Design an enzyme around this catalytic site. Sequence first.
Site, mmCIF file in Angstrom:
data_model
loop_
_atom_site.group_PDB
_atom_site.id
_atom_site.type_symbol
_atom_site.label_atom_id
_atom_site.label_comp_id
_atom_site.label_asym_id
_atom_site.label_seq_id
_atom_site.Cartn_x
_atom_site.Cartn_y
_atom_site.Cartn_z
ATOM 1 N N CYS G 33 4.146 6.463 2.705
ATOM 2 C CA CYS G 33 5.292 6.300 2.571
ATOM 3 C C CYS G 33 4.977 6.044 0.442
ATOM 4 C CB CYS G 33 6.563 5.704 2.728
ATOM 5 S SG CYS G 33 6.293 4.578 1.860
ATOM 6 N N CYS G 36 6.111 1.984 0.052
ATOM 7 C CA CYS G 36 6.019 1.009 0.471
ATOM 8 C C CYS G 36 5.161 0.680 -0.462
ATOM 9 C CB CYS G 36 5.620 1.594 2.188
ATOM 10 S SG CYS G 36 5.042 2.946 2.747
#
Lengths: 45, 88, 293, 318, 383, 275, 109
Positions: G33, G36
């Site tokens: 991701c 993040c």
Amino acid sequence: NLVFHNKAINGTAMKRLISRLIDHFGMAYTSHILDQVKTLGFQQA
Amino acid sequence: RIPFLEEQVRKIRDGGKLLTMDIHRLLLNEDNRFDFVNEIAAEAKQYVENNRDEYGAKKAILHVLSNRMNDAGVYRAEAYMESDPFKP
Amino acid sequence: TRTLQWKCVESRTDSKRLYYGRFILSPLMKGQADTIGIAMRRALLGEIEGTCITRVKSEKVPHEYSTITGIQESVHEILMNLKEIILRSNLYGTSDASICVKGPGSVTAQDIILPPYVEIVDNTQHIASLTEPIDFCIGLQIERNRGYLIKTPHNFQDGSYPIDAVFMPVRNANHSIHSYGNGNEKQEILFLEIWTNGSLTPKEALHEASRNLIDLFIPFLHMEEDNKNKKKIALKSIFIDQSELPSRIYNCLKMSNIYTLLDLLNNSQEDLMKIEHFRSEDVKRILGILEKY
Amino acid sequence: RTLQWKCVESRTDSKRLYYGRFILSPLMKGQADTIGIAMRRALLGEIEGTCITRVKSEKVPHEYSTITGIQESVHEILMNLKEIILRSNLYGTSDASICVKGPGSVTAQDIILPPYVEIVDNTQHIASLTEPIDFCIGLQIERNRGYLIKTPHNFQDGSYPIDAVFMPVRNANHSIHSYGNGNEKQEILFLEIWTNGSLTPKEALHEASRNLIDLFIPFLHMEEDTVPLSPFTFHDKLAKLIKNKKKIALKSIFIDQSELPSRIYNCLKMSNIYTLLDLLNNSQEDLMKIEHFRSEDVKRILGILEKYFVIDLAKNKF
Amino acid sequence: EELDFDGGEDISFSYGWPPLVCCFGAAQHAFVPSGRPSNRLVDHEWHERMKDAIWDPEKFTRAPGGCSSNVAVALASLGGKVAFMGKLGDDDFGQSLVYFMNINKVQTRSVRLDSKKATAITHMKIGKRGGLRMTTTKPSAEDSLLKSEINIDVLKEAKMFYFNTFSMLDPNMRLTTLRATKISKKLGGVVFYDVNLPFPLWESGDKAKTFIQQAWDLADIIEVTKQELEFLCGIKPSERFDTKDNDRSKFTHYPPEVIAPLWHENLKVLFVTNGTSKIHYYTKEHNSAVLGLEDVPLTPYTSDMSASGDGIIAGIIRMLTVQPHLMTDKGYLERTLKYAISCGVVDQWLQARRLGYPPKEGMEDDVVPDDHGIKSVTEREYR
Amino acid sequence: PSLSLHRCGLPREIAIELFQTFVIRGLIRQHLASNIGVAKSKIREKEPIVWEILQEVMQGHPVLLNRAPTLHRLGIQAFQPVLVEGRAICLHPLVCKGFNADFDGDQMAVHVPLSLEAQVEARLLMFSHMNLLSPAIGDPISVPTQDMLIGLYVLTSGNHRGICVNRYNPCNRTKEPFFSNSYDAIGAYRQKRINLDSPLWLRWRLDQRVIASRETPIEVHYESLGTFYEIYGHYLIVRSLKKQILFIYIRTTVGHIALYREIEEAIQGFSRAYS
Amino acid sequence: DYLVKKVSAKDIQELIKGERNVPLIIDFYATWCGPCILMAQELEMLAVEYESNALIVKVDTDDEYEFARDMQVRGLPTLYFISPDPNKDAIRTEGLIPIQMMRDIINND
Ligand SMILES: [Mg+2]
């Protein structure tokens, strides 16, 4: 209100046109008109 | 009313062709073009003698011409100075 | 931080049929401004969809194909008035429109019955004026193309009068470059000017042109899925004469503009067969002679 | 997926000269000219290259003086090093050196490079040696675009700069031919690319396309009027807008937040009125020219404005 | 079993041509539902040579999409008329979010603000053994919109309704979103079901199918991914997922016999998208697919490939809300797919150029109070 | 070519050598300078501030240019200097043609007035826009040069009209569509749909200034309803029964209308910028 | 050698079963991701200001897919602001939230 031209414009024609525009409009307008004519002529050539 | 005519108007206002028109317009009320020059020089000298640094925006002659054009109903810039807002 | 930003410095609405926009792209480097300007101008002048009236079915209205008794203007004048109608739509394909008006004295304006997809920008445009009492019925067809209508779909028409109307959503475009450099760095600022006919704002024209350019330049990245005499001139410059050959064959090859061994190797057997008076026995003998060394 | 492009020809005239031809057949009427001119202007002056920027000799009085054992002067050695073709992908400055001794000819194989930069020709002539003399030369590599003028001479003493040229593509050409489709006008596009060996014509084509896309991207960003490259560029901006200056808090307030019936809301939206400051700028007379409006909704908006705000800027009675 | 407030009829007065689109759900910032291993069409010859300058992740994982607010902003950027219906808090974060939407032309009249509940804060309880948390302590603003609060007027003006499966997780928000869907359906309009299965719904296929069976029936247009399509059915992935060559085993176009079970009566079109590489559409009488590029500058902060899906959905909605009578046509669907692929690629480019690269080993850049990022030229350094 | 009639291109080294006194005064005046030596060292250091002050000084200060051979009376003119990079003075093509330009490098002397009277005289009398008529008889001394005349001749020349445009006699068997405005004609020419020499019909807004020769029309199609078309060699007049000029169409090319439009728009822009 | 240290399956379910005197910030992240990765930078900036008053750990969601579903997680960028004391509850945040909200949560709650 300029005369519409449909024939060839040589050097004498441009000289007469400038001499008439100086008397009808003045040097202030004629300077800018001649500058624009120069620009258009350079672009076309 | 030509639609595509703003570019050359901005060019006239920026390059400094307004002064060439203003001089020719002011030379339409005077008989001799030498007395007008003398009067402008005298007015510029009198305006630069009062305040040395505060002669106008940049110069005094342009300031005198702008003052003479603003008293006739034609809005002109202070001493014909308009900087470019698009200069990084 | 050295991020290419764009701003709309000037915006004017001269009328409902004319707009104006001035834009600035500041941190451009040297040589990029002219390319960007030329590409954007070409995209604005050629790669923007427009909607106009293609065909006009005037057979419903009473007319003698040269003049109308009820309409003051001629058929040519009403066609020239119809071709100047500005329309805003996202039509796919073709659509039909109809205008019907009943009244003793009426000026046909913004009376077009259009589907919800199509809209009229200027409602003051006059199609026909000083209309005498008559049944005024006109059938219209609308299309959406980028350049123009090169060829009509139906070559033969009963009463439909095709109008050669260009779409041209953008009326004019121009660019300018202002150089701002002090020392070794030379930055350039681009100045885009857009004139639209009112069908779309000058701000949306930039986005449309940019997306069209990106869509045109993407295909270059598309990727399909996968599933003695032994020297150089000692044999190359060997003209056929040195290699002994029967006379018949020698003469034939010569008329065929075959002089060296490379010309013989380049020519295949099929074209060799084409040569006049050349036979299969010859092809086997020339192969042998070329292999007998 | 109707547009198809393929590499028609691919030749290698020399180790520093490549040629590739391409085709884009199903193209449309006016797209071919634009694609061709843009790709030409991108292949010539938008691709970047790595070249030797600065050369440092061992001990020479000036660049025009000769050196024993070597036929060519220092100027000819600099001109030969100028023509060396290198390949890299990382910006910055790297160092290299040549340290050949003995009689012979010093070539490109004698340049030792960092693990990032490589050589292409590997057979270019730098200088000639006639006596067993150590030849030790310093080099400096840099990646950039265009051609560099050796105007600066600071930060180093005893080194001679060379005017490098960061132009990988030598020449380019495009031709447009008709497709013959009858009614619809379709055109075929060809492309010729000559590269100096640092990158193949296909890679140059892809890189020019990516550069054109990067140049056309910024027009689709949000219009600029707080630090860039931050996902929270709107939080702190809004937090400080109403806190720093006055009369700007009205700009952050939009019509939507102010409770309004759907009719007045969508009518003001169709009238290019999006913020409360824009609703305060136009007087009460301007709210009548817009169609599908009445006199009671003016009283409604005035009442809810008096309930929300103290007074109005230009909506007062005049 | 639904209530309608007609009142005055202002349909033809000032509705405008572009049909309003109601995007239902929550308003978040940088939230990715889930992620599954996937593939991509790229040129490995160009990646093996520029391995020191190109950021290529080891294991590629694509997220199904972003959020409803992202889709709304993308559709408003494309030029469409959007409106977001959701509940947010009245704190600084909710106000900042509202601002974002507004500055991008999304219509926030529908959005409702609460003063007692926060924006992203949920209260939880430890619970019994095993770390089983309980979310009962407090709902977030997002998952607590009352049935009453639904702005009926928007649903009357809107012609296309958009909602995800993220709102159907909480039992309170599930009933609200189902009521909103049935209200927008009875008043006249098409429903777009963008199934983006969140993390808890990846346990088993039968539970995931029975969970979204309340939806998938009130919607006419459904957009699914290839991984979610294989997960809902019994199809097991049989690809490499780490190879360096395209073998046509990936990007598989399933026959219409696999799509038959999940098909129902009122379904019109089904879009199964493998990203901006290949998009397949299944209709009642025909089916086809359109290839795409999906070769864009991929940096950290952007490797999840969410703006691609957001732009695909935005383009599909923009093309289908203008000509509603051609949702079944083949050529118009192909043009819609091509436009959606272009929009997704453009949005991914824009997100990669906006959010720059993270600082490398040698970091001396000015510290942003919330993150740290450099441009592309800055990341292309020796050390 | 990019320079105006009054501006001139002044090289950097010549500009600083001329305005050294003014730039030193500007440095000592405001700040960043305490003595003449420090100011001279800063000017020799080639800093951006000294160039900025030089530009601010030469913004509106007139300069005089005079050729070494002063044969004609207009050999000494005044211009406004513009800071340009190079070793050559850039001048306007018209002024260069009026100053007897040569193929060889013509040396140009640059003089800078000091007193207020000299500046006023140079700005009000010696400018080029105030001296355009030669004192011999009154003919314009500033006329378009060779390239400009060639461009104007190619524009207003037209194309073939008879046997050179048609092979067979047209007696056995349409032109471009009737362009309502010259803007549409120029737009179609830029879109490369009509050639520069392709004839077209331009709707004239009954200005009644029909430029032609004393030549009767070739044909007059007098219909039965009463609206007759007078077909001339260059235009068409559609006249109704009760002596009314309904329509007027002009048969010309894009060059004539381009020249007419550019002159008219120059006049109108000058008149508008005057206000 | 950073501030926030990695944890595992069993060691993370021990600071809640024991006792502490400082709040515990459990961070869920996944390598893939993008968002993040940003969250981690601001978490480190927050932890460098609270060197002893706060403990910040992180746990991946690909090796611990079983410990995530029972934690009632719905998205990759998620935080859990649990408190030392018993009885007081847990705060779950979903998304990329500013550092000001994190400070206002760890100080006033
Ligand atoms: Mg000479």
